[PDB]
Amino acid sequence: TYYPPSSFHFLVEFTGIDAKNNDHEFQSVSGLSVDIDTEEFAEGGENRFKHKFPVKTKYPNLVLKRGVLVDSKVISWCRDAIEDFEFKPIDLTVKLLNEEHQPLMTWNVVHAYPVKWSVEDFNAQESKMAIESVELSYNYFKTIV
C-alpha cells in the first residue's frame, strides 16, 4: 500500500468444532501459498526454447503453533482421527487484522483434516516453554478482500 501492513496481528477460527477463546490464539501460522505443476516438450525446428504446459494446482499443508493447552477442543478432534480413523473435515478462516481489529484480508480454507501432532523435546537444563504443533491437510483456499 503506501505503507504496507505488518504481520504480527491475526486470528484463526474453526467451523464445526465447539468454540473456546483459548483455541483461537496462535503463536504462528504458515502454509498459505500455491503452485502449478508443468510439463515440457521439444518441438522439432524450434531451437529458441522448449514449450511448457500446466497440469495441476498444488497446495502445501497448513501449520499452526502455540504454547501447550491441556483442554483443547481442536486436539480432541485431532485425537479421534489419529487414534480411531474417524475423519470429519472442517473449514477454517485465517484473518489478518487492522488497528480496529477488523480484517484487512482473509483466507477461506476448505475441507481440512489432521495429519500431524507433536510437542517439542523436554530439557532439564534449559528455561523454555512447552510448545505444541499441529498440521492440517486441505483441498484449496480462496481469498476475500
Binding site: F8, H9, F10, L11, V12, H24, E25, F26, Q27, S28, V29, R66, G67, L97, H101, E126, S127, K128, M129
Partner: protein, 141 residues
Amino acid sequence: SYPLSKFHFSVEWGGTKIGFTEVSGLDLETEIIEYRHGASPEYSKIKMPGMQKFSNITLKRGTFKSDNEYFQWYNTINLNKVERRDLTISLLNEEHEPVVTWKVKNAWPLKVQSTDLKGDGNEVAIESMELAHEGLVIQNE
C-alpha cells in the same frame, strides 16, 4: 531510625580465623520467559519466572606467617572430589552478636590468587579466594 553500617562482620568457613578484609557476591537471580499470541490487542509480551542462578563469592584477607589455610582447602580437590563446607556470613551489632545472616550451602574453592611483589610496594600483601556454592538463604529477624 538509623540504617546499619558495613564494617563490623565475621565469616565462619571451617578455618582457624574469622577475620576478613573484604566479602562480595551475595546475589540471587531468576530468568524470564516471554510470550505473545498473534491475536492480542497489545503489542508487547507477557512475562513469567524461569530457572534460577547464584553468583560466586569472593573473600579477601592479609597474609600471615604460618597460615596456609587457603591452599590446604584448595588442595583437597581430587578429580571430582572436594571437601564441601557450610559457609556462614554475619553482620554484627555493638555486643558483637549477629543481626543479618547469609547462609550458604555446599561451598568449595574455584580459584586461589596470590599477591604481586614490587620493589617500591609499600603495602600489605593480600591473598584472595573465589567460591562456588549451591544456594543462599537470608535471615533478618
